[PDB]
Amino acid sequence: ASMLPQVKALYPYTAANDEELSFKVGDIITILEKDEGWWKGELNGQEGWIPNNYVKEILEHHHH
């Protein structure tokens, strides 16, 4: 398997069209693909574009 990038929403977002993904603050979104300022997210079995400046990538700096 591969570990995909995951991000945590900093602010909520309402999708502007069917191809975007809405989310609330704190949501943990999996990233399937990147296109400059928009990332393709997956959350609760739904997939759509999200603005990357609404979220913060979760990085593991250290072994647990």
Coordinates of N, CA and C in Angstrom, one line a residue:
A1 N 0.8 -1.2 0.0 CA 0.0 0.0 0.0 C 0.9 1.3 0.0
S2 N 0.2 2.4 -0.3 CA 0.8 3.7 -0.3 C 0.0 4.6 0.6
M3 N 0.7 5.4 1.4 CA 0.1 6.4 2.2 C -0.1 7.6 1.4
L4 N -1.3 8.0 1.3 CA -1.7 9.2 0.5 C -1.5 10.4 1.5
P5 N -1.3 11.6 0.9 CA -1.3 12.8 1.8 C -2.7 13.1 2.4
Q6 N -2.7 13.6 3.7 CA -3.9 14.0 4.3 C -3.8 15.4 4.8
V7 N -4.9 16.1 4.9 CA -4.9 17.5 5.2 C -6.0 17.7 6.2
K8 N -5.8 18.7 7.1 CA -6.9 19.1 8.0 C -7.5 20.4 7.7
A9 N -8.8 20.5 7.5 CA -9.4 21.8 7.2 C -9.2 22.8 8.3
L10 N -8.8 24.0 7.9 CA -8.6 25.1 8.8 C -9.9 26.0 8.9
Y11 N -10.6 26.1 7.7 CA -11.9 26.9 7.7 C -12.9 26.0 6.9
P12 N -14.2 26.2 7.1 CA -15.1 25.4 6.3 C -15.1 26.0 4.9
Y13 N -15.6 25.2 4.0 CA -15.7 25.5 2.5 C -17.0 24.9 2.0
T14 N -17.8 25.7 1.3 CA -18.9 25.2 0.5 C -18.6 25.2 -1.0
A15 N -18.7 24.0 -1.5 CA -18.5 23.8 -2.9 C -19.2 24.7 -3.8
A16 N -18.6 25.3 -4.8 CA -19.2 26.2 -5.7 C -19.9 25.5 -6.9
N17 N -19.7 24.2 -7.0 CA -20.2 23.5 -8.2 C -20.0 22.0 -7.8
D18 N -20.7 21.2 -8.6 CA -20.7 19.7 -8.4 C -19.4 19.0 -8.3
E19 N -18.3 19.6 -8.9 CA -17.1 19.0 -9.0 C -16.1 19.4 -7.8
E20 N -16.6 20.3 -7.0 CA -15.9 20.6 -5.7 C -16.5 19.8 -4.6
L21 N -15.7 19.8 -3.5 CA -16.0 19.1 -2.2 C -16.2 20.2 -1.1
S22 N -17.3 20.1 -0.5 CA -17.5 20.9 0.8 C -16.9 20.2 2.0
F23 N -16.7 21.0 3.1 CA -16.1 20.4 4.3 C -16.2 21.5 5.4
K24 N -16.0 21.0 6.6 CA -16.0 21.8 7.8 C -14.7 21.8 8.4
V25 N -14.5 22.7 9.4 CA -13.2 22.8 10.1 C -12.9 21.6 10.8
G26 N -11.7 21.1 10.7 CA -11.3 19.9 11.3 C -11.3 18.7 10.5
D27 N -12.1 18.7 9.4 CA -12.2 17.6 8.6 C -10.9 17.1 8.1
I28 N -10.7 15.8 8.1 CA -9.4 15.2 7.6 C -9.7 14.6 6.2
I29 N -9.1 15.3 5.2 CA -9.3 15.0 3.8 C -8.1 14.3 3.2
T30 N -8.3 13.2 2.5 CA -7.3 12.5 1.8 C -7.1 13.1 0.4
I31 N -5.8 13.3 -0.1 CA -5.5 13.9 -1.3 C -5.2 12.9 -2.4
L32 N -5.9 13.0 -3.5 CA -5.8 12.0 -4.6 C -4.9 12.6 -5.7
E33 N -4.8 13.9 -5.9 CA -4.3 14.5 -7.0 C -4.1 16.0 -6.7
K34 N -3.2 16.7 -7.4 CA -3.0 18.2 -7.2 C -3.1 18.9 -8.5
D35 N -3.6 20.1 -8.5 CA -3.7 20.9 -9.7 C -3.5 22.4 -9.2
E36 N -2.2 22.8 -9.0 CA -1.9 24.1 -8.5 C -2.7 24.4 -7.2
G37 N -3.5 25.4 -7.2 CA -4.2 25.8 -6.0 C -5.3 25.0 -5.6
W38 N -5.7 24.0 -6.4 CA -6.8 23.1 -6.0 C -6.4 21.7 -6.0
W39 N -6.8 21.0 -4.9 CA -6.4 19.6 -4.7 C -7.6 18.7 -4.8
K40 N -7.4 17.5 -5.3 CA -8.6 16.6 -5.3 C -8.7 15.8 -4.0
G41 N -9.7 16.1 -3.2 CA -9.9 15.5 -1.9 C -10.9 14.4 -1.9
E42 N -10.8 13.6 -0.9 CA -11.7 12.5 -0.6 C -12.0 12.5 0.8
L43 N -13.4 12.5 1.1 CA -13.9 12.7 2.5 C -15.2 11.9 2.5
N44 N -15.3 10.9 3.4 CA -16.5 10.2 3.7 C -17.1 9.6 2.4
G45 N -16.3 9.1 1.5 CA -16.7 8.5 0.3 C -17.2 9.5 -0.8
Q46 N -16.9 10.8 -0.6 CA -17.1 11.7 -1.7 C -15.8 12.3 -2.2
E47 N -15.7 12.7 -3.4 CA -14.4 13.2 -4.1 C -14.7 14.5 -4.8
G48 N -13.9 15.5 -4.6 CA -14.1 16.7 -5.3 C -12.9 17.6 -5.1
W49 N -12.8 18.7 -5.9 CA -11.7 19.6 -5.7 C -12.0 20.5 -4.4
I50 N -10.9 20.8 -3.8 CA -10.8 21.7 -2.6 C -9.7 22.7 -2.8
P51 N -9.9 23.9 -2.3 CA -8.8 25.0 -2.3 C -7.8 24.7 -1.3
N52 N -6.5 24.5 -1.7 CA -5.5 24.1 -0.8 C -5.2 25.1 0.3
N53 N -5.5 26.4 0.1 CA -5.3 27.4 1.1 C -6.4 27.4 2.2
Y54 N -7.3 26.4 2.2 CA -8.2 26.1 3.3 C -7.8 25.1 4.2
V55 N -6.7 24.4 3.9 CA -6.3 23.3 4.7 C -4.8 23.3 4.9
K56 N -4.4 22.4 5.8 CA -3.0 22.2 6.2 C -2.6 20.7 6.2
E57 N -1.6 20.5 5.4 CA -1.1 19.1 5.2 C -0.6 18.5 6.5
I58 N -0.9 17.3 6.8 CA -0.5 16.6 8.1 C 0.7 15.9 7.8
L59 N 1.8 16.2 8.4 CA 3.1 15.6 8.1 C 3.6 14.8 9.4
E60 N 4.2 13.7 9.2 CA 4.7 12.9 10.4 C 6.2 13.2 10.4
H61 N 6.6 14.1 11.4 CA 8.0 14.5 11.5 C 8.9 13.4 12.2
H62 N 8.3 12.6 13.0 CA 8.9 11.7 13.9 C 8.2 10.3 13.9
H63 N 9.0 9.3 14.2 CA 8.5 7.9 14.3 C 7.6 7.8 15.6
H64 N 6.5 7.1 15.6 CA 5.6 6.8 16.7 C 5.5 5.3 16.9

